[PDB]
PDB file of all heavy atoms in Angstrom:
ATOM      1  N   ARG R   1      28.658 -38.314  33.680  1.00 26.60           N
ATOM      2  CA  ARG R   1      29.774 -38.148  34.632  1.00 26.60           C
ATOM      3  C   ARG R   1      29.406 -37.130  35.654  1.00 26.60           C
ATOM      4  O   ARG R   1      30.254 -36.671  36.437  1.00 26.60           O
ATOM      5  CB  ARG R   1      31.033 -37.764  33.856  1.00 26.60           C
ATOM      6  CG  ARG R   1      31.557 -38.856  32.946  1.00 26.60           C
ATOM      7  CD  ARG R   1      32.961 -38.571  32.462  1.00 26.60           C
ATOM      8  NE  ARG R   1      33.444 -39.545  31.483  1.00 26.60           N
ATOM      9  CZ  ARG R   1      34.698 -39.703  31.102  1.00 26.60           C
ATOM     10  NH1 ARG R   1      35.623 -38.911  31.600  1.00 26.60           N
ATOM     11  NH2 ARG R   1      35.036 -40.571  30.187  1.00 26.60           N
ATOM     12  N   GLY R   2      28.109 -36.751  35.646  1.00 30.02           N
ATOM     13  CA  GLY R   2      27.670 -35.759  36.590  1.00 30.02           C
ATOM     14  C   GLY R   2      27.668 -34.273  36.201  1.00 30.02           C
ATOM     15  O   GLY R   2      27.262 -33.437  37.020  1.00 30.02           O
ATOM     16  N   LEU R   3      28.094 -33.985  34.974  1.00 27.05           N
ATOM     17  CA  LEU R   3      28.129 -32.565  34.555  1.00 27.05           C
ATOM     18  C   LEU R   3      26.764 -32.084  34.093  1.00 27.05           C
ATOM     19  O   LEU R   3      26.023 -32.848  33.430  1.00 27.05           O
ATOM     20  CB  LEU R   3      29.157 -32.390  33.449  1.00 27.05           C
ATOM     21  CG  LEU R   3      30.606 -32.864  33.745  1.00 27.05           C
ATOM     22  CD1 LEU R   3      31.480 -32.511  32.580  1.00 27.05           C
ATOM     23  CD2 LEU R   3      31.088 -32.207  35.002  1.00 27.05           C
ATOM     24  N   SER R   4      26.442 -30.832  34.373  1.00 24.40           N
ATOM     25  CA  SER R   4      25.195 -30.290  33.904  1.00 24.40           C
ATOM     26  C   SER R   4      25.448 -29.961  32.427  1.00 24.40           C
ATOM     27  O   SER R   4      26.241 -29.068  32.121  1.00 24.40           O
ATOM     28  CB  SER R   4      24.814 -29.010  34.656  1.00 24.40           C
ATOM     29  OG  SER R   4      25.921 -28.162  34.800  1.00 24.40           O
ATOM     30  N   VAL R   5      24.857 -30.739  31.511  1.00 26.52           N
ATOM     31  CA  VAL R   5      25.110 -30.584  30.078  1.00 26.52           C
ATOM     32  C   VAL R   5      23.933 -30.102  29.270  1.00 26.52           C
ATOM     33  O   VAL R   5      22.765 -30.387  29.480  1.00 26.52           O
ATOM     34  CB  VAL R   5      25.569 -31.903  29.478  1.00 26.52           C
ATOM     35  CG1 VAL R   5      25.940 -31.707  28.031  1.00 26.52           C
ATOM     36  CG2 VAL R   5      26.770 -32.403  30.267  1.00 26.52           C
ATOM     37  N   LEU R   6      24.315 -29.313  28.215  1.00 27.47           N
ATOM     38  CA  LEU R   6      23.369 -28.747  27.252  1.00 27.47           C
ATOM     39  C   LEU R   6      23.970 -28.988  25.834  1.00 27.47           C
ATOM     40  O   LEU R   6      25.102 -28.604  25.628  1.00 27.47           O
ATOM     41  CB  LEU R   6      23.144 -27.275  27.484  1.00 27.47           C
ATOM     42  CG  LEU R   6      22.369 -26.496  26.419  1.00 27.47           C
ATOM     43  CD1 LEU R   6      20.907 -26.929  26.391  1.00 27.47           C
ATOM     44  CD2 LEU R   6      22.424 -25.018  26.704  1.00 27.47           C
ATOM     45  N   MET R   7      23.165 -29.609  24.980  1.00 28.55           N
ATOM     46  CA  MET R   7      23.617 -29.834  23.608  1.00 28.55           C
ATOM     47  C   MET R   7      22.756 -28.978  22.650  1.00 28.55           C
ATOM     48  O   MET R   7      21.529 -29.011  22.723  1.00 28.55           O
ATOM     49  CB  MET R   7      23.466 -31.297  23.246  1.00 28.55           C
ATOM     50  CG  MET R   7      23.900 -31.580  21.817  1.00 28.55           C
ATOM     51  SD  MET R   7      23.773 -33.365  21.377  1.00 28.55           S
ATOM     52  CE  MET R   7      22.046 -33.496  21.012  1.00 28.55           C
ATOM     53  N   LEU R   8      23.398 -28.304  21.721  1.00 26.31           N
ATOM     54  CA  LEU R   8      22.719 -27.462  20.747  1.00 26.31           C
ATOM     55  C   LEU R   8      22.847 -27.945  19.313  1.00 26.31           C
ATOM     56  O   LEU R   8      23.936 -28.193  18.802  1.00 26.31           O
ATOM     57  CB  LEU R   8      23.287 -26.029  20.828  1.00 26.31           C
ATOM     58  CG  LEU R   8      22.583 -25.046  21.773  1.00 26.31           C
ATOM     59  CD1 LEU R   8      22.143 -25.712  23.027  1.00 26.31           C
ATOM     60  CD2 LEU R   8      23.502 -23.850  22.036  1.00 26.31           C
ATOM     61  N   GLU R   9      21.687 -28.104  18.661  1.00 25.17           N
ATOM     62  CA  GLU R   9      21.622 -28.577  17.260  1.00 25.17           C
ATOM     63  C   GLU R   9      20.845 -27.546  16.428  1.00 25.17           C
ATOM     64  O   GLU R   9      19.695 -27.260  16.728  1.00 25.17           O
ATOM     65  CB  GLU R   9      20.920 -29.960  17.176  1.00 25.17           C
ATOM     66  CG  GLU R   9      20.560 -30.379  15.740  1.00 25.17           C
ATOM     67  CD  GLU R   9      21.729 -30.318  14.825  1.00 25.17           C
ATOM     68  OE1 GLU R   9      22.819 -30.780  15.193  1.00 25.17           O
ATOM     69  OE2 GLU R   9      21.539 -29.769  13.699  1.00 25.17           O
ATOM     70  N   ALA R  10      21.540 -26.999  15.446  1.00 21.85           N
ATOM     71  CA  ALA R  10      20.957 -25.997  14.584  1.00 21.85           C
ATOM     72  C   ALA R  10      19.691 -26.379  13.838  1.00 21.85           C
ATOM     73  O   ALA R  10      18.756 -25.542  13.634  1.00 21.85           O
ATOM     74  CB  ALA R  10      22.002 -25.523  13.553  1.00 21.85           C
ATOM     75  N   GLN R  11      19.580 -27.621  13.400  1.00 21.74           N
ATOM     76  CA  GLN R  11      18.368 -28.070  12.690  1.00 21.74           C
ATOM     77  C   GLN R  11      17.832 -29.338  13.352  1.00 21.74           C
ATOM     78  O   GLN R  11      17.105 -29.244  14.378  1.00 21.74           O
ATOM     79  CB  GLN R  11      18.699 -28.376  11.202  1.00 21.74           C
ATOM     80  CG  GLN R  11      17.454 -28.820  10.461  1.00 21.74           C
ATOM     81  CD  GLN R  11      17.761 -29.214   9.008  1.00 21.74           C
ATOM     82  OE1 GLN R  11      16.964 -29.884   8.376  1.00 21.74           O
ATOM     83  NE2 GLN R  11      18.916 -28.763   8.497  1.00 21.74           N
ATOM     84  N   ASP R  12      18.145 -30.514  12.842  1.00 19.94           N
ATOM     85  CA  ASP R  12      17.665 -31.741  13.452  1.00 19.94           C
ATOM     86  C   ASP R  12      18.867 -32.665  13.788  1.00 19.94           C
ATOM     87  O   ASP R  12      19.923 -32.460  13.244  1.00 19.94           O
ATOM     88  CB  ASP R  12      16.704 -32.525  12.515  1.00 19.94           C
ATOM     89  CG  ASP R  12      16.130 -33.758  13.203  1.00 19.94           C
ATOM     90  OD1 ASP R  12      15.851 -33.686  14.382  1.00 19.94           O
ATOM     91  OD2 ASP R  12      16.009 -34.765  12.498  1.00 19.94           O
ATOM     92  N   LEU R  13      18.635 -33.557  14.734  1.00 18.66           N
ATOM     93  CA  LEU R  13      19.695 -34.502  15.172  1.00 18.66           C
ATOM     94  C   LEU R  13      20.110 -35.288  13.935  1.00 18.66           C
ATOM     95  O   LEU R  13      19.277 -35.813  13.178  1.00 18.66           O
ATOM     96  CB  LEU R  13      19.120 -35.473  16.206  1.00 18.66           C
ATOM     97  CG  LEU R  13      18.619 -34.842  17.501  1.00 18.66           C
ATOM     98  CD1 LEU R  13      17.856 -35.846  18.321  1.00 18.66           C
ATOM     99  CD2 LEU R  13      19.811 -34.301  18.319  1.00 18.66           C
ATOM    100  N   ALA R  14      21.439 -35.423  13.733  1.00 21.43           N
ATOM    101  CA  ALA R  14      22.008 -36.126  12.579  1.00 21.43           C
ATOM    102  C   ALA R  14      21.561 -35.641  11.219  1.00 21.43           C
ATOM    103  O   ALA R  14      21.690 -36.352  10.239  1.00 21.43           O
ATOM    104  CB  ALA R  14      21.664 -37.598  12.733  1.00 21.43           C
ATOM    105  N   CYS R  15      21.121 -34.375  11.134  1.00 23.08           N
ATOM    106  CA  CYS R  15      20.681 -33.877   9.869  1.00 23.08           C
ATOM    107  C   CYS R  15      21.797 -33.728   8.825  1.00 23.08           C
ATOM    108  O   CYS R  15      21.482 -33.513   7.655  1.00 23.08           O
ATOM    109  CB  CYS R  15      20.001 -32.529  10.040  1.00 23.08           C
ATOM    110  SG  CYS R  15      21.123 -31.126  10.325  1.00 23.08           S
ATOM    111  N   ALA R  16      23.033 -33.772   9.229  1.00 21.42           N
ATOM    112  CA  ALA R  16      24.106 -33.644   8.299  1.00 21.42           C
ATOM    113  C   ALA R  16      24.906 -34.935   8.029  1.00 21.42           C
ATOM    114  O   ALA R  16      24.326 -35.928   7.607  1.00 21.42           O
ATOM    115  CB  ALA R  16      25.094 -32.522   8.771  1.00 21.42           C
ATOM    116  N   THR R  17      26.217 -34.866   8.266  1.00 24.60           N
ATOM    117  CA  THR R  17      27.073 -36.006   7.980  1.00 24.60           C
ATOM    118  C   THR R  17      26.669 -37.346   8.651  1.00 24.60           C
ATOM    119  O   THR R  17      26.797 -38.383   7.994  1.00 24.60           O
ATOM    120  CB  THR R  17      28.517 -35.763   8.407  1.00 24.60           C
ATOM    121  OG1 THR R  17      28.901 -34.397   8.104  1.00 24.60           O
ATOM    122  CG2 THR R  17      29.442 -36.730   7.636  1.00 24.60           C
ATOM    123  N   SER R  18      26.239 -37.269   9.916  1.00 24.77           N
ATOM    124  CA  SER R  18      25.853 -38.483  10.653  1.00 24.77           C
ATOM    125  C   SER R  18      24.650 -39.238  10.086  1.00 24.77           C
ATOM    126  O   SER R  18      24.390 -40.351  10.585  1.00 24.77           O
ATOM    127  CB  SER R  18      25.615 -38.082  12.115  1.00 24.77           C
ATOM    128  OG  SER R  18      26.889 -37.836  12.737  1.00 24.77           O
ATOM    129  N   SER R  19      23.956 -38.715   9.088  1.00 24.57           N
ATOM    130  CA  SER R  19      22.855 -39.504   8.488  1.00 24.57           C
ATOM    131  C   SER R  19      23.195 -39.771   7.020  1.00 24.57           C
ATOM    132  O   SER R  19      22.405 -40.339   6.294  1.00 24.57           O
ATOM    133  CB  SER R  19      21.534 -38.732   8.631  1.00 24.57           C
ATOM    134  OG  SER R  19      21.549 -37.520   7.909  1.00 24.57           O
ATOM    135  N   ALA R  20      24.441 -39.429   6.622  1.00 21.50           N
ATOM    136  CA  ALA R  20      24.873 -39.621   5.264  1.00 21.50           C
ATOM    137  C   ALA R  20      25.995 -40.627   5.116  1.00 21.50           C
ATOM    138  O   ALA R  20      26.742 -40.605   4.088  1.00 21.50           O
ATOM    139  CB  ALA R  20      25.325 -38.264   4.657  1.00 21.50           C
ATOM    140  N   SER R  21      26.157 -41.547   6.057  1.00 21.37           N
ATOM    141  CA  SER R  21      27.251 -42.551   6.031  1.00 21.37           C
ATOM    142  C   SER R  21      26.868 -43.804   5.279  1.00 21.37           C
ATOM    143  O   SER R  21      25.751 -43.928   4.801  1.00 21.37           O
ATOM    144  CB  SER R  21      27.644 -42.908   7.473  1.00 21.37           C
ATOM    145  OG  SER R  21      26.714 -43.759   8.090  1.00 21.37           O
ATOM    146  N   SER R  22      27.844 -44.695   5.238  1.00 21.40           N
ATOM    147  CA  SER R  22      27.596 -46.022   4.505  1.00 21.40           C
ATOM    148  C   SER R  22      26.897 -46.902   5.575  1.00 21.40           C
ATOM    149  O   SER R  22      26.571 -48.069   5.286  1.00 21.40           O
ATOM    150  CB  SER R  22      28.908 -46.663   4.062  1.00 21.40           C
ATOM    151  OG  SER R  22      29.528 -45.810   3.117  1.00 21.40           O
ATOM    152  N   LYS R  23      26.721 -46.384   6.790  1.00 21.54           N
ATOM    153  CA  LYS R  23      26.061 -47.105   7.876  1.00 21.54           C
ATOM    154  C   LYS R  23      26.761 -48.360   8.306  1.00 21.54           C
ATOM    155  O   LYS R  23      26.109 -49.370   8.602  1.00 21.54           O
ATOM    156  CB  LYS R  23      24.611 -47.394   7.495  1.00 21.54           C
ATOM    157  CG  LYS R  23      23.744 -46.148   7.385  1.00 21.54           C
ATOM    158  CD  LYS R  23      23.004 -46.093   6.022  1.00 21.54           C
ATOM    159  CE  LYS R  23      22.176 -44.832   5.873  1.00 21.54           C
ATOM    160  NZ  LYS R  23      22.999 -43.592   5.878  1.00 21.54           N
ATOM    161  N   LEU R  24      28.095 -48.335   8.355  1.00 25.52           N
ATOM    162  CA  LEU R  24      28.847 -49.504   8.760  1.00 25.52           C
ATOM    163  C   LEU R  24      29.688 -49.206   9.987  1.00 25.52           C
ATOM    164  O   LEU R  24      30.198 -48.111  10.208  1.00 25.52           O
ATOM    165  CB  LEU R  24      29.877 -49.881   7.639  1.00 25.52           C
ATOM    166  CG  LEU R  24      29.300 -50.279   6.264  1.00 25.52           C
ATOM    167  CD1 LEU R  24      30.492 -50.673   5.396  1.00 25.52           C
ATOM    168  CD2 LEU R  24      28.341 -51.443   6.393  1.00 25.52           C
ATOM    169  N   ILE R  25      29.767 -50.241  10.842  1.00 28.04           N
ATOM    170  CA  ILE R  25      30.601 -50.183  12.023  1.00 28.04           C
ATOM    171  C   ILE R  25      31.723 -51.104  11.554  1.00 28.04           C
ATOM    172  O   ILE R  25      31.601 -52.307  11.711  1.00 28.04           O
ATOM    173  CB  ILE R  25      29.921 -50.714  13.270  1.00 28.04           C
ATOM    174  CG1 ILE R  25      28.622 -49.975  13.539  1.00 28.04           C
ATOM    175  CG2 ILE R  25      30.865 -50.611  14.487  1.00 28.04           C
ATOM    176  CD1 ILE R  25      27.786 -50.524  14.703  1.00 28.04           C
ATOM    177  N   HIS R  26      32.750 -50.549  11.004  1.00 27.86           N
ATOM    178  CA  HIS R  26      33.835 -51.303  10.444  1.00 27.86           C
ATOM    179  C   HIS R  26      35.165 -50.881  11.045  1.00 27.86           C
ATOM    180  O   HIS R  26      35.312 -49.799  11.594  1.00 27.86           O
ATOM    181  CB  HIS R  26      33.881 -51.188   8.941  1.00 27.86           C
ATOM    182  CG  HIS R  26      34.131 -49.767   8.448  1.00 27.86           C
ATOM    183  ND1 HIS R  26      34.848 -49.507   7.340  1.00 27.86           N
ATOM    184  CD2 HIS R  26      33.706 -48.571   8.931  1.00 27.86           C
ATOM    185  CE1 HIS R  26      34.882 -48.213   7.120  1.00 27.86           C
ATOM    186  NE2 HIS R  26      34.172 -47.636   8.075  1.00 27.86           N
ATOM    187  N   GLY R  27      36.161 -51.706  10.869  1.00 29.01           N
ATOM    188  CA  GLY R  27      37.476 -51.420  11.349  1.00 29.01           C
ATOM    189  C   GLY R  27      38.298 -50.620  10.317  1.00 29.01           C
ATOM    190  O   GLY R  27      39.387 -50.066  10.660  1.00 29.01           O
ATOM    191  N   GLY R  28      37.781 -50.538   9.122  1.00 29.71           N
ATOM    192  CA  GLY R  28      38.378 -49.804   8.027  1.00 29.71           C
ATOM    193  C   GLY R  28      39.498 -50.590   7.339  1.00 29.71           C
ATOM    194  O   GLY R  28      40.648 -50.258   7.343  1.00 29.71           O
ATOM    195  N   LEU R  29      39.072 -51.669   6.719  1.00 32.98           N
ATOM    196  CA  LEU R  29      39.981 -52.593   6.004  1.00 32.98           C
ATOM    197  C   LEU R  29      40.933 -51.875   5.015  1.00 32.98           C
ATOM    198  O   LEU R  29      42.140 -52.156   5.038  1.00 32.98           O
ATOM    199  CB  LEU R  29      39.173 -53.611   5.231  1.00 32.98           C
ATOM    200  CG  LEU R  29      39.929 -54.663   4.439  1.00 32.98           C
ATOM    201  CD1 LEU R  29      40.769 -55.525   5.358  1.00 32.98           C
ATOM    202  CD2 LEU R  29      38.888 -55.569   3.706  1.00 32.98           C
ATOM    203  N   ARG R  30      40.443 -50.930   4.226  1.00 37.62           N
ATOM    204  CA  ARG R  30      41.270 -50.219   3.311  1.00 37.62           C
ATOM    205  C   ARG R  30      42.319 -49.315   3.862  1.00 37.62           C
ATOM    206  O   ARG R  30      43.325 -48.987   3.240  1.00 37.62           O
ATOM    207  CB  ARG R  30      40.378 -49.407   2.336  1.00 37.62           C
ATOM    208  CG  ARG R  30      40.045 -48.016   2.824  1.00 37.62           C
ATOM    209  CD  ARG R  30      39.061 -47.330   1.866  1.00 37.62           C
ATOM    210  NE  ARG R  30      38.904 -45.930   2.209  1.00 37.62           N
ATOM    211  CZ  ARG R  30      39.742 -44.985   1.869  1.00 37.62           C
ATOM    212  NH1 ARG R  30      40.845 -45.282   1.168  1.00 37.62           N
ATOM    213  NH2 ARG R  30      39.563 -43.713   2.242  1.00 37.62           N
ATOM    214  N   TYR R  31      42.147 -48.902   5.142  1.00 39.47           N
ATOM    215  CA  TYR R  31      43.108 -48.017   5.803  1.00 39.47           C
ATOM    216  C   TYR R  31      44.419 -48.763   6.166  1.00 39.47           C
ATOM    217  O   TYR R  31      45.440 -48.124   6.506  1.00 39.47           O
ATOM    218  CB  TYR R  31      42.528 -47.405   7.070  1.00 39.47           C
ATOM    219  CG  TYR R  31      41.159 -46.741   6.895  1.00 39.47           C
ATOM    220  CD1 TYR R  31      40.153 -46.875   7.826  1.00 39.47           C
ATOM    221  CD2 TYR R  31      40.873 -45.962   5.755  1.00 39.47           C
ATOM    222  CE1 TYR R  31      38.912 -46.282   7.657  1.00 39.47           C
ATOM    223  CE2 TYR R  31      39.649 -45.378   5.527  1.00 39.47           C
ATOM    224  CZ  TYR R  31      38.663 -45.543   6.491  1.00 39.47           C
ATOM    225  OH  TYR R  31      37.414 -44.945   6.336  1.00 39.47           O
ATOM    226  N   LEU R  32      44.414 -50.094   6.093  1.00 39.26           N
ATOM    227  CA  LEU R  32      45.595 -50.885   6.388  1.00 39.26           C
ATOM    228  C   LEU R  32      46.711 -50.625   5.414  1.00 39.26           C
ATOM    229  O   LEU R  32      47.885 -50.608   5.783  1.00 39.26           O
ATOM    230  CB  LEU R  32      45.243 -52.357   6.408  1.00 39.26           C
ATOM    231  CG  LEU R  32      44.415 -52.849   7.614  1.00 39.26           C
ATOM    232  CD1 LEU R  32      44.143 -54.334   7.472  1.00 39.26           C
ATOM    233  CD2 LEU R  32      45.167 -52.555   8.930  1.00 39.26           C
ATOM    234  N   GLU R  33      46.374 -50.403   4.139  1.00 42.14           N
ATOM    235  CA  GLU R  33      47.379 -50.186   3.107  1.00 42.14           C
ATOM    236  C   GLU R  33      48.061 -48.856   3.404  1.00 42.14           C
ATOM    237  O   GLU R  33      49.190 -48.610   2.945  1.00 42.14           O
ATOM    238  CB  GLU R  33      46.714 -50.101   1.739  1.00 42.14           C
ATOM    239  CG  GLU R  33      46.736 -51.459   0.973  1.00 42.14           C
ATOM    240  CD  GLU R  33      46.263 -51.308  -0.454  1.00 42.14           C
ATOM    241  OE1 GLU R  33      45.813 -50.195  -0.847  1.00 42.14           O
ATOM    242  OE2 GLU R  33      46.326 -52.319  -1.189  1.00 42.14           O
ATOM    243  N   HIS R  34      47.454 -48.011   4.151  1.00 40.34           N
ATOM    244  CA  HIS R  34      48.021 -46.682   4.536  1.00 40.34           C
ATOM    245  C   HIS R  34      48.641 -46.754   5.918  1.00 40.34           C
ATOM    246  O   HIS R  34      49.178 -45.753   6.397  1.00 40.34           O
ATOM    247  CB  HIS R  34      46.923 -45.643   4.514  1.00 40.34           C
ATOM    248  CG  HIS R  34      46.372 -45.338   3.177  1.00 40.34           C
ATOM    249  ND1 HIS R  34      47.203 -44.810   2.169  1.00 40.34           N
ATOM    250  CD2 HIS R  34      45.138 -45.481   2.602  1.00 40.34           C
ATOM    251  CE1 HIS R  34      46.474 -44.678   1.027  1.00 40.34           C
ATOM    252  NE2 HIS R  34      45.203 -45.076   1.283  1.00 40.34           N
ATOM    253  N   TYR R  35      48.603 -47.932   6.567  1.00 43.05           N
ATOM    254  CA  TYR R  35      49.198 -48.126   7.881  1.00 43.05           C
ATOM    255  C   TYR R  35      48.573 -47.394   8.990  1.00 43.05           C
ATOM    256  O   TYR R  35      49.203 -47.020   9.980  1.00 43.05           O
ATOM    257  CB  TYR R  35      50.707 -47.789   7.775  1.00 43.05           C
ATOM    258  CG  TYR R  35      51.429 -48.552   6.713  1.00 43.05           C
ATOM    259  CD1 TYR R  35      52.093 -47.886   5.667  1.00 43.05           C
ATOM    260  CD2 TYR R  35      51.389 -49.948   6.652  1.00 43.05           C
ATOM    261  CE1 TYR R  35      52.697 -48.536   4.640  1.00 43.05           C
ATOM    262  CE2 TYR R  35      52.043 -50.612   5.611  1.00 43.05           C
ATOM    263  CZ  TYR R  35      52.663 -49.954   4.605  1.00 43.05           C
ATOM    264  OH  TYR R  35      53.290 -50.604   3.619  1.00 43.05           O
ATOM    265  N   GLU R  36      47.248 -47.114   8.893  1.00 40.30           N
ATOM    266  CA  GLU R  36      46.498 -46.436   9.957  1.00 40.30           C
ATOM    267  C   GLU R  36      46.122 -47.476  11.040  1.00 40.30           C
ATOM    268  O   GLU R  36      44.932 -47.712  11.279  1.00 40.30           O
ATOM    269  CB  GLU R  36      45.223 -45.841   9.331  1.00 40.30           C
ATOM    270  CG  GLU R  36      45.470 -44.694   8.311  1.00 40.30           C
ATOM    271  CD  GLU R  36      45.793 -43.353   8.972  1.00 40.30           C
ATOM    272  OE1 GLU R  36      45.768 -43.298  10.270  1.00 40.30           O
ATOM    273  OE2 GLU R  36      46.049 -42.405   8.278  1.00 40.30           O
ATOM    274  N   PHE R  37      47.147 -48.050  11.649  1.00 40.49           N
ATOM    275  CA  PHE R  37      46.903 -49.052  12.690  1.00 40.49           C
ATOM    276  C   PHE R  37      46.177 -48.607  13.952  1.00 40.49           C
ATOM    277  O   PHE R  37      45.378 -49.369  14.494  1.00 40.49           O
ATOM    278  CB  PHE R  37      48.242 -49.724  13.056  1.00 40.49           C
ATOM    279  CG  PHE R  37      48.950 -50.358  11.889  1.00 40.49           C
ATOM    280  CD1 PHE R  37      50.267 -49.973  11.604  1.00 40.49           C
ATOM    281  CD2 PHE R  37      48.317 -51.266  11.088  1.00 40.49           C
ATOM    282  CE1 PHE R  37      50.911 -50.527  10.505  1.00 40.49           C
ATOM    283  CE2 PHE R  37      48.987 -51.874  10.037  1.00 40.49           C
ATOM    284  CZ  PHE R  37      50.299 -51.501   9.717  1.00 40.49           C
TER     285      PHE R  37
END
């Protein structure tokens, strides 16, 4: 969008939660029972 940007990562890219997922791009079927529309 034209902004001068700087991103800081303490260790490695995705070294935490982002590399520990079920690796699914899902809509969250189970969240429907909770009404998370």
